[PDB]
Amino acid sequence: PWAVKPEDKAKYDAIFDSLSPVNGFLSGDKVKPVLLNSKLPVDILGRVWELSDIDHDGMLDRDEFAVAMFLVYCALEKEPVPMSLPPALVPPSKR
Numbered sequence: 470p471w472a473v474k475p476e477d478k479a480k481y482d483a484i485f486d487s488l489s490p491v492n493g494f495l496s497g498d499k500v501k502p503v504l505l506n507s508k509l510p511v512d513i514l515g516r517v518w519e520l521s522d523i524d525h526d527g528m529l530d531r532d533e534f535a536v537a538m539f540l541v542y543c544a545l546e547k548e549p550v551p552m553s554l555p556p557a558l559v560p561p562s563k564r
């Protein structure tokens with residue numbers, strides 16, 4: 470299934486709407502700070518975001534911002550983040 474779970478997409482959809490979503494999008498100006506509070510370096514926010522910004526336009530939609538929350542929260546516990554968007558974390562819209 471999708472690397473993100475329904476319980477994770479629920480906290481991701483709250484964190485996504487905790488930055489002020491725009492018609493279903495968030496500007497790096499909101500997620501950026503939301504990627505730093507993770508205590509991670511800008512390298513993770515540079516890779517995680519990349520694998521999170523399905524569109525890669527400096528913004529994260531509710532589904533793209535979701536991929537950036539579990540990709541970050543995993544770097545705080547112990548799971549680092551690669552730079553290759555895996556097909557298990559990507560939605561059927563990237564197919």
Ligand SMILES: [Ca+2]
Nearest residue numbers: 524528529530
């Ligand atoms: Ca986007």
